[PDB]
């Protein structure tokens, strides 16, 4: 997996 | 009679209020008396600097938590590179304090803002679930400016616990009215990513929000898909201004960018709307957005008029949010009827895809049954198919009233051979249309390559009222  | 913000940076917050009439019309909502008082918003990100001079005044411990380190303090982890500044920037967009001589102001500058530190560590299903399900009866709106990687080749969504959290949220959150989940559609524009390959944005429980540059264009990072509901301003080229908000280490930034900045603004506007009518359900909220969003001013090569006369684009959804219009309509809004669900399995046999496949089907939308639908809301096309090169595929769904939703556009980087296993492509473009009639599914090979595959399942799922 999870990214900003 | 209303006096606007005196904050030093307010004048630079072009998206909130501007002579150019190319803004989110937020001042119009403030003038009507709405600033988010009494509403609780939580930012699910990499933390929140609760002691920031422009946030402390509105910080709410009850809407915060640290899932990464298992404690109630969501303070960011400081590092030389300032990696964990993201959540703080998003928080400021929603509820930065007003008239305090510091930086700018949030859309809902009187709302209570909280933060869940959950991106700074291993983001597991349990992690997402605890964040999405944090205090469903205290927190009204959840904002998420994160999601699956935007490499333009992956298909990913929430796991069991997260889904269960979404479902419990819209069912039981806010005393039954349902938690409002605002999501950023994604930054995979450069990789030709599709936000319908993102189970979070693609979900009917979340309001997926896209971006528009100051001059009204589709940003380079923007992803197109039929699941996006509306749009809010964000960054573009270097001649276009960006987002002004609170930054890590008690600073003020004028360069918050990308899809990350859009969701928070939507969350803020939705906060103002809830103050205008606290009895709005999670579905009522989506209705308000569809009805009040403005296309005008936004440039796109795919604006099309749906069956009910509204303009929709896969890059903007129903258009730019209008805070003034939102709070206005919210006041006289009559809660919609109970949500009905009509399931229609279409295939009676597998179908070869080849160069192009077309599947027609006349449906009655559950006529004569308790879940008969005449006024559509979300629509899903659950497909299960095999293909040698997934990215070469392009899928379209045409409603009886002629609205053409592109469920999936070509993704040149997607070389997967795993196809789609009961993936629920969702579209918001036929909202309010009568779903009965002939629906058409189109699957085509957008490449010259001799690809091959089989469509084994196509289930049409209609949500709505009568
Ligand atoms: Ca902590
Ligand atoms: Ca301020
Ligand atoms: Ca994406
Ligand atoms: Na969604």
């Amino acid at each position: 997996x999870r990214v900003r | 009679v209303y006096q606007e913000p005196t904050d030093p940076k307010f004048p630079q917050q072009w998206y909130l209020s501007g002579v150019t009439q190319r803004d989110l019309n937020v001042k119009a909502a403030w003038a009507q008396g709405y600033t988010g008082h009494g509403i609780v918003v939580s930012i699910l990100d990499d933390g929140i600097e609760k002691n920031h001079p422009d946030l402390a005044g509105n910080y709410d411990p009850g809407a915060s938590f640290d899932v990464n380190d298992q404690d109630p303090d969501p303070q960011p982890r400081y590092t030389q590179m300032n990696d964990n500044r993201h959540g703080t920037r998003c928080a400021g967009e929603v509820a930065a304090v007003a008239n305090n001589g510091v930086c700018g102001v949030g859309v809902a500058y009187n709302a209570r803002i909280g933060g869940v530190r959950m991106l700074d560590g291993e983001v597991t299903d349990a992690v997402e679930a605890r964040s999405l399900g944090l205090n469903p009866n205290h927190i009204h709106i959840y904002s998420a400016s994160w999601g699956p990687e935007d490499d333009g080749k992956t298909v990913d969504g929430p796991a069991r616990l997260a889904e269960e959290a979404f479902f419990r949220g819209v069912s039981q959150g806010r005393g039954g009215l349902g938690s409002i989940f605002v999501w950023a559609s994604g930054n995979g524009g450069r990789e030709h990513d599709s936000c319908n390959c993102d189970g979070y944005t693609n979900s009917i429980y979340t309001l997926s929000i896209s971006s528009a540059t100051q001059f009204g264009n589709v940003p380079w990072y923007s992803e197109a898909c039929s699941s996006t509901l509306a749009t809010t301003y964000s960054s573009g080229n270097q001649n276009e201004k960006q987002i002004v908000t609170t930054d890590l280490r008690q600073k003020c930034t004028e360069s918050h960018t990308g899809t990350s900045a859009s969701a928070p603004l939507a969350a803020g506007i939705i906060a103002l709307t809830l103050e205008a009518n606290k009895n709005l359900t999670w579905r009522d909220m989506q209705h308000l957005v569809v009805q009040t969003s403005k296309p005008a001013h936004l440039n796109a090569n795919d604006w099309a008029t749906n069956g009910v006369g509204r303009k929709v684009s896969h890059s903007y959804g129903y258009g730019l949010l209008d805070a003034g219009a939102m709070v206005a309509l919210a006041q006289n809004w009559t809660t919609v009827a109970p949500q009905r669900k009509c399931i229609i399995d279409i295939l009676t046999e597998p179908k070869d895809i080849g160069k192009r496949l077309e599947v027609r089907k006349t449906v009655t939308a559950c006529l004569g049954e308790p879940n008969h639908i005449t006024r559509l809301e979300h629509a899903q096309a659950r497909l299960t198919l095999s293909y040698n090169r997934r990215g070469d595929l392009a899928i379209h769904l045409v409603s009886p009233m002629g609205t053409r939703s592109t469920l999936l556009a070509a993704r040149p980087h997607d070389y997967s051979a795993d196809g789609f296993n009961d993936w629920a492509f969702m579209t918001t473009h036929s909202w309010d249309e009568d779903p009965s009639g002939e629906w058409v599914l189109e699957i085509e090979n957008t490449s010259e390559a001799n690809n091959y595959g089989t469509l084994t399942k196509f289930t049409l799922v209609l949500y709505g009222t009568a």
Side-chain angles (χ1 to χ4, degrees):
Chain A
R2 298 294 177 258
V3 307
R4 296 177 181 63
Chain B
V1 66
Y2 172 71
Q3 304 312 114
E4 71 182 15
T6 59
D7 303 72
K9 296 298 185 184
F10 179 59
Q12 286 94 79
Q13 301 189 289
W14 56 277
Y15 45 95
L16 294 180
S17 197
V19 294
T20 182
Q21 195 72 182
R22 299 296 190 300
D23 56 65
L24 299 177
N25 198 33
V26 177
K27 186 181 176 179
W30 295 333
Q32 295 181 58
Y34 302 112
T35 58
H37 175 85
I39 305 300
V40 181
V41 175
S42 179
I43 304 299
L44 310 189
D45 218 273
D46 62 15
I48 181 172
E49 194 171 66
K50 64 180 187 296
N51 60 307
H52 187 300
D54 220 24
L55 292 179
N58 288 327
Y59 178 69
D60 180 354
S64 307
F65 201 80
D66 184 346
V67 178
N68 286 157
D69 290 339
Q70 256 62 282
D71 67 65
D73 189 341
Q75 193 75 33
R77 174 173 61 87
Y78 298 91
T79 72
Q80 263 192 304
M81 287 173 75
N82 287 311
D83 310 71
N84 304 300
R85 69 186 183 180
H86 193 257
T88 293
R89 291 183 170 201
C90 294
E93 295 182 76
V94 180
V97 181
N99 311 312
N100 70 322
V102 182
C103 203
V105 303
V107 167
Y109 60 71
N110 270 314
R112 280 152 83 197
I113 186 78
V116 176
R117 179 166 177 266
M118 46 75 69
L119 288 185
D120 195 23
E122 219 207 312
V123 181
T124 63
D125 183 38
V127 171
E128 282 167 24
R130 298 187 69 217
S131 302
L132 295 167
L134 176 68
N135 270 93
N137 295 303
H138 177 64
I139 299 184
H140 305 102
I141 298 158
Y142 297 71
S143 184
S145 298
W146 51 270
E149 180 163 359
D150 294 311
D151 57 0
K153 57 182 183 176
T154 72
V155 183
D156 193 3
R160 257 69 171 162
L161 295 180
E163 299 193 84
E164 281 175 349
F166 275 130
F167 211 117
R168 293 173 75 75
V170 301
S171 303
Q172 295 128 56
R174 287 168 61 223
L177 301 175
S179 302
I180 305 295
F181 295 111
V182 179
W183 223 278
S185 56
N187 286 329
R190 195 223 295 160
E191 319 315 310
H192 300 93
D193 199 14
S194 185
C195 38
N196 273 6
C197 288
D198 177 322
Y200 300 80
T201 48
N202 194 62
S203 176
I204 72 172
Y205 312 133
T206 74
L207 298 84
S208 196
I209 307 299
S210 286
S211 303
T213 68
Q214 170 173 39
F215 303 156
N217 295 301
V218 180
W220 64 271
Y221 52 78
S222 176
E223 301 191 24
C225 66
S226 58
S227 70
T228 296
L229 200 62
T231 300
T232 64
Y233 284 109
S234 190
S235 58
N237 63 48
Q238 300 191 215
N239 296 76
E240 293 169 307
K241 292 177 188 171
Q242 311 188 319
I243 306 309
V244 176
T245 184
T246 54
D247 203 354
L248 198 61
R249 296 170 190 292
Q250 307 175 62
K251 293 176 189 167
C252 181
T253 176
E254 287 174 52
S255 46
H256 184 29
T257 69
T259 187
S260 292
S262 287
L265 295 176
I269 292 179
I270 291 175
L272 306 183
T273 303
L274 279 184
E275 165 167 38
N277 186 340
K278 298 188 176 301
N279 277 175
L280 292 173
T281 70
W282 67 276
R283 284 160 64 249
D284 281 330
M285 189 57 65
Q286 282 187 46
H287 274 278
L288 289 181
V289 173
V290 175
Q291 282 187 42
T292 56
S293 298
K294 311 290 192 304
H297 297 309
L298 259 37
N299 307 301
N301 186 294
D302 69 323
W303 282 113
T305 307
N306 63 10
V308 295
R310 291 194 261 241
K311 311 282 286 308
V312 293
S313 163
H314 294 58
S315 273
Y316 304 129
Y318 284 81
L320 219 57
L321 292 180
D322 191 320
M326 284 286 282
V327 298
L329 190 61
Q331 297 178 61
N332 289 180
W333 189 260
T334 285
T335 280
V336 299
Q339 183 206 63
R340 301 181 174 202
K341 185 179 182 179
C342 180
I343 305 177
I344 308 155
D345 229 359
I346 312 292
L347 307 190
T348 61
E349 49 151 49
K351 256 59 188 297
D352 195 64
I353 295 173
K355 231 299 173 186
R356 189 175 128 106
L357 166 65
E358 205 184 78
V359 177
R360 291 170 172 281
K361 172 71 172 191
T362 296
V363 308
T364 61
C366 288
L367 181 58
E369 306 168 13
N371 48 173
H372 166 51
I373 292 171
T374 64
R375 229 196 178 207
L376 189 72
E377 280 174 6
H378 310 83
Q380 302 176 308
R382 310 188 70 93
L383 315 180
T384 302
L385 63 81
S386 53
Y387 212 62
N388 58 301
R389 225 235 173 214
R390 196 167 57 188
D392 289 352
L393 291 173
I395 307 176
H396 306 283
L397 179 65
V398 187
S399 76
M401 295 182 95
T403 302
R404 205 178 163 71
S405 300
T406 294
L407 308 185
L408 176 77
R411 294 204 298 166
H413 296 307
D414 184 359
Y415 59 87
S416 172
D418 309 322
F420 285 105
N421 179 37
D422 189 43
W423 187 255
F425 295 92
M426 190 275 274
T427 183
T428 66
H429 297 207
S430 287
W431 194 281
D432 275 317
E433 291 183 11
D434 182 309
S436 70
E438 195 193 30
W439 280 89
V440 182
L441 180 72
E442 309 181 5
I443 304 178
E444 69 179 325
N445 173 356
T446 67
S447 154
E448 291 301 315
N450 289 291
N451 299 319
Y452 54 98
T454 305
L455 171 67
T456 66
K457 196 183 94 311
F458 164 35
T459 305
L460 188 61
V461 184
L462 311 173
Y463 290 96
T465 62

